[model samples]
Target: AEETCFDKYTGNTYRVGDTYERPKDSMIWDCTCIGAGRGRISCTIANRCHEGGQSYKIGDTWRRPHETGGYMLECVCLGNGKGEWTCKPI
Candidate 1:
């Protein structure tokens, strides 16, 4: 079984509501997720002045190595009961 912070679902996307501490760090920030209908799901950090008032768009991928943030992720249903996904900084 895969260890997930939240429940697993097929073809469903969710946004992190609060700031999150990225793996291996203790910073905190907010972000939004791009919808899964576009064939990809990712999150983008909002501008400092915008806070949680921003939304993520398609084809946007940003990485921060030493900051705390959250993401919006999506999992598309590919059938065969094998739909799964995870997020990590890179």
Candidate 2:
């Protein structure tokens, strides 16, 4: 579980859960194509306030989730300046 909540692409940190209400665009991960290399630390921003490393890999990519009060919320990984990952109700 992580704590703070953030948007994908950019490594901007927002108030946990209140991100949608007070969105501040970090403006990171701005990409026009998949031509950029992956695994850049810029992909993720952790307000963890600790000195430790954690990560996960899928396919040809890797990610480290932000831990905000034990909440698995934001993940700054790779790709377009869209989302580290996004969720929508179906």
Candidate 3:
């Protein structure tokens, strides 16, 4: 499988209770905001495991579905700078 490094996000300012959206047909597992912090919130979808017991991990790569062809991950931070986030398949 070919590896694709999307620009994702960098040097962007994120505030408390801020929400971000991902692209269509993309499955996001995690997200990072510059200067804000890293992995502030763990993606619940990441907790979902396959029949084989394989769990998703941030920075780790995986194969996209045959029809969609790839995954797009998005993270939205929430709360009073406490750094809360969520993810979903789009």
Candidate 4:
């Protein structure tokens, strides 16, 4: 009896208590289906960063050696819900 959640953006259907991820803007979102009712889908930031079609999770650190700037750049995931990516010279 229409007991599945539908994700409009991804055109996906989810069962109750199902969890998944979807892309939004330049970030990722962790989503869940609570039930088959109005606005039954819940979501939050995945606490990850998206870059150049790739994604990195919290506490993930990487280096960009070929950046425009001469110095190498290092980025770290803060593990915060905001998916904050902090970068600095390495």
Candidate 5:
């Protein structure tokens, strides 16, 4: 039934129309209960990407010092599912 919603990621429960935020080291998830049991958690990113002690908005790019040094790592704040910050040596 559509009476209860359980969050497997955080082991939390919610009811319909209930909203919450799960904060991670670099991201925050805005979650809501739209259904019951499975597929009941609807989530989106409420904040941008935080990396290398810096914050970036969606679609923003920045360069950081690579682990090996003498190289630059380019990272972007992607606004896809759950939001993602990916980096590559350039």
Candidate 6:
């Protein structure tokens, strides 16, 4: 039984909408899984690539310790390059 893991890379308690300060120029990702009982919580949090304004390619992936709050993430952009990203947890 794994408890709800937070802050990805750093093991902290977390929820859905928790934001942390990070460098403005780079991208970051944070993912937390809250199961009823503590079990398995191993996410691949990474320091994503240049800037957070990218309308990143679909089926593409970004890893950052900051942009998260994940296990596996996928990009969900509507195209047109307007830049709207939402990471889905799998």
* Full-model lDDT for every candidate: 0.30, 0.30, 0.35, 0.77, 0.73, 0.42
Q: What are the RMSDs of all candidates, in order?
A: 17.9, 17.9, 15.5, 3.1, 6.4, 14.4
Poorly placed runs, candidate 5 (over 4 Å): 36-39, 53-90
Q: By TM-score, who's the top model here?
A: 4
Ten residues in a row with the worst lDDT in model 3?
47-56
**lDDT value, candidate 3, whole model:** 0.35
Provide TM-scores for the models: 0.19, 0.16, 0.20, 0.69, 0.45, 0.24
- Sorted on lDDT, best first, the list reads 4, 5, 6, 3, 1, 2
What residue pairs are clashing in model 3?
25-90, 26-72, 27-72, 28-73
lDDT of 2 by residue, 1-90 (tens): 334434453454344323222112422221221112332222233221111233222212333343443333333334233223332222
lDDT of each residue in 1-90, candidate 1, tens digit only: 321232122223344332232211221223233333432333333322111332222232333333444544332222222222223544
Residue 70, candidate 2: C-alpha displacement in angstroms? 60
Candidate 4 backbone collisions, by pair = none
- Candidates 1 and 4: which is better by lDDT? 4
Better of 3 and 5 by TM-score: 5
lDDT of 3 by residue, 13-87 (tens): 344334443322334333322222332421234323222233333333333343355766443332223323354
| Overall local distance difference test of candidate 6 | 0.42
Q: Model 5 over residues 7-53: C-alpha lDDT tens digits?
A: 77677778888998765555566788887446467777545666666
TM-score of 4: 0.69
Q: Quick one: best lDDT, which candidate?
A: 4
Alpha-carbon runs more than 4 Å astray in model 6: 1-55, 63-72
TM-score of 5: 0.45
Q: For model 2, what is the error of residue 6's alpha carbon versus the real structure, in angstroms, after optimal superposition? A: 3.3
Candidate that beats the other on lDDT, 4 or 6, i.e. the better one: 4
